[PDB]
């Protein structure tokens, strides 16, 4: 019961500000990012899955190779570089980053027509709820 191939827009954020603080994002970026709420458009195609991000500010596409490893340069976010992998624990999805800090390792869980998840970073939890647009 997982089908990413669709359209998902962000509704709100309860810790997008606090999460920006973990990576020590500028005061300007935090300001701009507040009004911003990128819309993700996933395109599943086998073992290759691309997660779009179109905020009309700066395009940051990634190539999530399910089960396989790939680097991930976070330059544009908070200027970072690491190695990320993704697994399928079960009904949920779980991505682990072999970087620094203590938290960097995403987790997900879909619950219908709203792509919910639990972002983690440096011990901080960021709940960002995305809704299907269909
Ligand atoms: C702060 C900030 C941004 C947030 C970027 C992030 C954090 C994207 C998330 C990537 C992940 C974690 C993907 C795993 O599926 C963007 C550039 C987009 C817009 C303005 C500045």
In short:
The protein is built from 2 helices and 12 strands; from the N terminus they run E-H-H-E-E-E-E-E-E-E-E-E-E-E.
Task: List its traits.
monomer; mainly beta; six-stranded antiparallel beta sheet; 12 strands; binds retinol; vitamin a; cytoplasm; lipid droplet; CRBP1
Characterise this structure.
The protein is mainly beta. It has a single domain, classed as Calycin beta-barrel core domain (Lipocalin, Beta Barrel), CATH 2.40.128. It contains two helices and twelve strands. It has helices spanning 18-22, 27-35; strands spanning 6-13, 39-45, 48-51, 62-65, 70-73, 81-87, 93-97, 107-108, 114-115, 119-121, 124-126, 128-132. Strand 2 and strand 3 (48-51) form a beta hairpin. It starts with 5 loop residues before the first strand and ends with a strand. It binds retinol. Residues 29, 33, 36, 38, 51, 53, 55, 57-58, 60, 76-77, 106 line the site of retinol. It is classed as lipid binding protein.
Q: Largest sheet, order of strands side by side? A: 4-3-2-1-12-9
> What's the total number of strands?
12
The secondary structure category is mainly beta
What is the class in the CATH system? Mainly Beta
Range of strand content: 35-45%
| Spatial extent as radius of gyration | 14 Å
CATH architecture: Beta Barrel
Task: List the helices and strands in order.
Answer: EHHEEEEEEEEEEE
* Distinct helical segment count: 2
| CATH H-tier superfamily | Calycin beta-barrel core domain
Overall tally of domains: 1
Task: Give me the secondary-structure topology.
Blueprint: E1 6-13, H1 18-22, H2 27-35, E2 39-45, E3 48-51, E4 62-65, E5 70-73, E6 81-87, E7 93-97, E8 107-108, E9 114-115, E10 119-121, E11 124-126, E12 128-132
Antiparallel strand pairs: 1-2, 1-12, 2-3, 3-4, 5-6, 6-7, 7-8, 9-12, 10-11
This protein binds retinol.
Family: Belongs to the calycin superfamily. Fatty-acid binding protein (FABP) family.
Keywords: Cytoplasm, Lipid droplet, Retinol-binding, Transport, Vitamin A
Subcellular location: Cytoplasm; Lipid droplet
